[PDB]
Amino acid sequence: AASSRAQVLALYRAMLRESKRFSAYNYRTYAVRRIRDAFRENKNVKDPVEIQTLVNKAKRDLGVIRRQVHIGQLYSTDKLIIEN
Amino acid sequence: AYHKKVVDHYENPRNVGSLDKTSKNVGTGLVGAPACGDVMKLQIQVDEKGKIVDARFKTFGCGSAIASSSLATEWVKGKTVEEALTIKNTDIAKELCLPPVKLHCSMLAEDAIKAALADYKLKQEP
Amino acid sequence: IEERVKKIIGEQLGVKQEEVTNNASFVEDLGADSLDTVELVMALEEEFDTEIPDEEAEKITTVQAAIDYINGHQ
Amino acid sequence: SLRPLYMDVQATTPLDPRVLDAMLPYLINYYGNPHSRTHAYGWESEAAMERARQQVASLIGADPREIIFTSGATESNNIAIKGVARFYRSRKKHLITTQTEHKCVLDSCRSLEAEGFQVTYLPVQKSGIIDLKELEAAIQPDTSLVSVMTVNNEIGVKQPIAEIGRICSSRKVYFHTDAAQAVGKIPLDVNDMKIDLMSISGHKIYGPKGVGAIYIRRRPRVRVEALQSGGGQERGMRSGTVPTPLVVGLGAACEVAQQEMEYDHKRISKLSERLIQNIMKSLPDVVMNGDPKHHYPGCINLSFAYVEGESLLMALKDVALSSGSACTSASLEPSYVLRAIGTDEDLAHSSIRFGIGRFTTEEEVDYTVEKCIQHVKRLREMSPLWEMVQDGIDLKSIKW
Ligand SMILES: *P(=O)(O)OCC(C)(C)[C@@H](O)C(=O)NCCC(=O)NCCSC(=O)CCCCCCCCCCC
Ligand SMILES: C#CC[C@H](NCc1c(COP(=O)(O)O)cnc(C)c1O)C(=O)O
Ligand SMILES: O=C(O)CN(CCN(CC(=O)O)CC(=O)O)CC(=O)O
């Protein structure tokens, strides 16, 4: 059986590191914040089945982040006034 | 507002202020209405030879109204009272490259010039 | 000073710089959980433009261990 | 050069990356026509369409059979208002709406008036909220439809939709709500609210432009006469090729909004309070348009006395904002919404709209607040109205 804790902490790191590569400020800042908030909100779930559902969703979303980071680098634009 | 020429009169303001209404050498034009979104106050200071030597403005209005009245205030300086009378709305609009929906701004700025100049002429009659 | 390591750890963990002692464990002494320590390791990576892989990150459980890792990687 | 902050989410939203990710397979390899019945490009396109339909239905508490896809909330509003009125025109000639509805509702009602229908345009209170008892009194024996929007796009006020549905249900009058600014942002349940028709827009909820839906209740059966003639797609209610990538995007945006709604509402509420309170404590004569007790926090409409709203937008050169409206008569001719809630005409010229959404950051809010404070002060120092009030003149006493 795979360790949910090992999976969870490794997804957490991967998801944060990949989200930080979003070229666009509003996706990048949203993704990092949302990942941090969601893992923390779900920290106390105890049902092994619900945990696995949350892990599977996180893996799905990590795929989304990888693909959308790369698309946003192919079609990037200038930064916002406030990244100055 | 989008044109560089219009925005410049807000980002690099010139002649914003007031002159002394009670002066016999100061004319004040106050045109427009708050309910129409455009109110311009234009004041001219005229020397004893009839040359406008200074001017100030305040405007409540969109950027083109601010730019039209700011331009008008620059343009009256150094003109005699009779010369300033020939500044037209269409000169202001051409200089600022105003679109048709903002042509009303240049017309109000010409109204402000003529109001200021008429208040001044009223004061000289005695 | 590379002890900027202390600034990051206090920032990340919400503990006064006074409490961030060279001996302290993030979990046992400073109240971190394992989500905090993932982020803390990443903040050190960002702060010192260094890449900290898992087998090294796993050993960085105290203030000094973080100070020593950063000093030994330029 | 560097780009402005986006604070204009009531005009449209960025695509959520999860929504673009769900759409892109249908833009690349799954390009079939969902009505092509004889092959796998058709079958897989149809299946994606039907999954999207269920995603929309689940967000609002509907049966997927009640979801009709359209090109946007404008088209959905036309279908609901003209389609109901024309279906019952031989028995019912009267409709009710409000004076603050979006232009597509108002213009649809105006076109029906040129068709010989009677329309009551209800006033709203100064809060922006209708008076339920005035609605009740306005319903006539030939009233076929009431249409009242859920959240106002210019001032963010929430109409009492569930209470309106109670009134309409009990009189057997159909109740339509334009929910374009509410779907995915506040809870909507068609059965608890007793809604008969509802308009939905994809690009108000981080989905793609060019797509929408209309909910049409099937029990009790609501009847609508179709406006777009054609091949009978969408149960005869909306002919034309259903655009699979767009409806996939709309369903994905609805499912994302269903998951994210509560988290977004808590974050936007906090940012909204921060923006309003920090502007108001640093500037005198700032008034919020619309009742804060019945208000969606992501749409903030403030007036800044003695400063004209378009000059303030120009001054705020690195923030994308608006003066409201159908991206049209907002500050040009003053907002008819601000006029309907009794705003003085000069103050309606002084109003601007701030939008906070799912991706807005606290830093963006603070930057916007800081710049708004600086430029309102600057514009007031350039304003003859401010100069006069500072010299103790009453502006209500000048002959303009
Ligand atoms: P540590 O203190 O030793 O342990 C931390 C964990 C969470 C591993 C520990 O507390 C634990 O095991 N808890 C049991 C419950 C659990 O595992 N919770 C986490 C489940 S996984 C999860 O919650 C992921 C949610 C994913 C959200 C992603 C948002 C994506 C946005 C992208 C948009 C562009
Ligand atoms: C769009 C936009 C701007 C926004 N209001 C528009 C909207 C619509 C129109 O929907 P679409 O046709 O899908 O674009 C219909 N009803 C409402 C309530 C809104 O908000 C604005 O800038 O005010
Ligand atoms: O992690 C985050 O919250 C997002 N960004 C911070 C956003 N930045 C903008 C930038 O990096 O240009 C903040 C700013 O400069 O306002 C981190 C990163 O750069 O990887």
Author numbering:
A (entry chain B): 2 to 85
B (entry chain D): 34 to 159
C (entry chain C): 3 to 76
D (entry chain A): 55 to 454
Paper text:
However, in the NFS1 active site, we observed an external l-propargylglycine-ketimine, which is an analogue of the external Cys-ketimine intermediate that can be formed by both l-Cys and d-Cys. This l-propargylglycine-ketimine was structurally similar to a l-propargylglycine bound to the class II cysteine desulfurase SufS from Bacillus subtilis. Therefore, we used our structure to model either an l-Cys-ketimine or a d-Cys-ketimine into the active centre of NFS1. In creating these models, we superimposed the N-Cα-C(O) backbone of l-Cys or d-Cys on that of l-propargylglycine. In the case of l-Cys-ketimine, the Cys sulfur was located in close proximity to both the strictly conserved proton-abstracting His156NFS1 (2.9 Å)46 and the persulfide-accepting Cys381NFS1 (2.8 Å). In our NFS1 model, the d-Cys-ketimine sulfur was positioned in the almost opposite direction compared with l-Cys-ketimine, pointing towards Lys258NFS1. As a consequence, the sulfur was located far from both His156NFS1 and Cys381NFS1 (3.6 Å and 5.4 Å, respectively), thus making sulfur transfer to Cys381NFS1 both catalytically and sterically unfavourable. We conclude that the altered location of the d-Cys sulfur is incompatible with sulfur mobilization and persulfidation. In summary, NFS1 readily and efficiently forms the Cys-ketimine intermediate with both l-Cys and d-Cys but steric hindrance in the case of d-Cys prevents subsequent sulfur transfer to the acceptor Cys381NFS1.
